[PDB]
Design a protein around this motif. Structure first.
Motif, PDB file in Angstrom:
ATOM      1  N   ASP A  69       0.698  -1.278   0.234  1.00 21.56           N
ATOM      2  CA  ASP A  69      -0.201   0.125  -0.402  1.00 21.56           C
ATOM      3  C   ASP A  69       0.952   1.239   0.043  1.00 21.56           C
ATOM      4  O   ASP A  69       0.545   2.322  -0.622  1.00 21.56           O
ATOM      5  N   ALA A  70       1.778   0.717   0.870  1.00 29.96           N
ATOM      6  CA  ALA A  70       2.840   2.187   0.737  1.00 29.96           C
ATOM      7  C   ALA A  70       3.509   2.163  -1.087  1.00 29.96           C
ATOM      8  O   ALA A  70       3.499   4.056  -1.235  1.00 29.96           O
ATOM      9  N   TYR A  71       3.030   1.519  -1.620  1.00 30.80           N
ATOM     10  CA  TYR A  71       3.845   2.122  -2.853  1.00 30.80           C
ATOM     11  C   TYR A  71       2.625   2.490  -3.321  1.00 30.80           C
ATOM     12  O   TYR A  71       2.945   3.107  -4.405  1.00 30.80           O
ATOM     13  N   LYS A  72       1.098   2.064  -3.495  1.00 30.70           N
ATOM     14  CA  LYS A  72       0.723   2.137  -4.678  1.00 30.70           C
ATOM     15  C   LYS A  72       0.401   4.304  -3.616  1.00 30.70           C
ATOM     16  O   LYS A  72      -0.641   4.925  -4.474  1.00 30.70           O
ATOM     17  N   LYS A  73      -0.034   4.117  -2.717  1.00 33.12           N
ATOM     18  CA  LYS A  73       0.106   5.353  -1.956  1.00 33.12           C
ATOM     19  C   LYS A  73       0.719   6.327  -2.621  1.00 33.12           C
ATOM     20  O   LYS A  73       0.727   7.346  -2.893  1.00 33.12           O
ATOM     21  N   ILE A  74       2.673   6.219  -2.961  1.00 39.03           N
ATOM     22  CA  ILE A  74       3.364   6.811  -3.461  1.00 39.03           C
ATOM     23  C   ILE A  74       3.496   7.121  -4.738  1.00 39.03           C
ATOM     24  O   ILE A  74       3.375   8.142  -4.867  1.00 39.03           O
ATOM     25  N   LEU A  75       1.941   6.326  -5.439  1.00 35.23           N
ATOM     26  CA  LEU A  75       2.190   6.600  -6.693  1.00 35.23           C
ATOM     27  C   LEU A  75       1.378   7.924  -6.816  1.00 35.23           C
ATOM     28  O   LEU A  75       1.691   8.978  -7.684  1.00 35.23           O
ATOM     29  N   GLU A  76       0.282   8.137  -5.551  1.00 33.20           N
ATOM     30  CA  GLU A  76      -0.580   8.837  -5.320  1.00 33.20           C
ATOM     31  C   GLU A  76       0.290  10.937  -5.079  1.00 33.20           C
ATOM     32  O   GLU A  76       0.301  11.379  -5.530  1.00 33.20           O
ATOM     33  N   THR A  77       1.348   9.991  -3.713  1.00 33.45           N
ATOM     34  CA  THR A  77       2.017  10.998  -3.609  1.00 33.45           C
ATOM     35  C   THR A  77       2.855  11.036  -4.826  1.00 33.45           C
ATOM     36  O   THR A  77       2.791  12.614  -4.794  1.00 33.45           O
ATOM     37  N   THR A  78       3.662  10.508  -5.109  1.00 32.98           N
ATOM     38  CA  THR A  78       5.193  11.299  -5.895  1.00 32.98           C
ATOM     39  C   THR A  78       5.594  10.460  -6.820  1.00 32.98           C
ATOM     40  O   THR A  78       6.216  11.516  -8.495  1.00 32.98           O
ATOM     41  N   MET A  79       4.417  10.034  -7.334  1.00 37.08           N
ATOM     42  CA  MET A  79       5.016   8.638  -9.024  1.00 37.08           C
ATOM     43  C   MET A  79       4.301   9.050  -9.711  1.00 37.08           C
ATOM     44  O   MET A  79       3.638   9.444  -9.367  1.00 37.08           O
ATOM     45  N   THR A  80       3.981   8.401 -10.915  1.00 39.37           N
ATOM     46  CA  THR A  80       3.959   9.034 -12.369  1.00 39.37           C
ATOM     47  C   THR A  80       3.556   7.085 -12.507  1.00 39.37           C
ATOM     48  O   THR A  80       4.016   7.079 -12.091  1.00 39.37           O
TER      49      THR A  80
END
Length: 112
Positions: A25-36
């Protein structure tokens, strides 16, 4: 989780890093957060995490400490390496060595 066996090819790195069975969830979160949609983007990772109270120094280091692929494009597993080191940093635990990741049975999720 994982026990030690002398296999002259198999890596003996933290179980949770190479677990491709499930994405955190930290990864998919990071999508929302900073990832593209195009993948990893540390560009936004700096201000947000530095606003989380983390050093833009350590933050850059953490992206770069992907096993031994510093100038490499962070793959999902390598993004577990970043996520976990961010998490431990927030907890007041600096990233000193792979031995310290070895000391964590389970990898924490960064709070944001």
């Amino acid at each position: 989780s994982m026990f030690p066996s002398q296999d002259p090819a198999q890596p003996r790195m933290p179980p949770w890093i190479y677990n491709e069975s499930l994405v955190p969830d930290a990864y998919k979160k990071i999508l929302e957060t900073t990832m593209t949609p195009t993948g990893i983007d540390t560009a936004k990772l700096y201000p947000i995490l530095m606003s989380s109270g983390l050093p833009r120094e350590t933050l850059g280091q953490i992206w770069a400490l992907a096993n031994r692929t510093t100038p490499g494009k962070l793959t999902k597993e390598e993004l577990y390496t970043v996520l976990a080191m961010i998490a431990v940093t927030q907890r007041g635990v600096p990233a000193m060595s792979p031995d310290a990741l070895n000391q964590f049975p389970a990898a924490p999720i960064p709070t944001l």
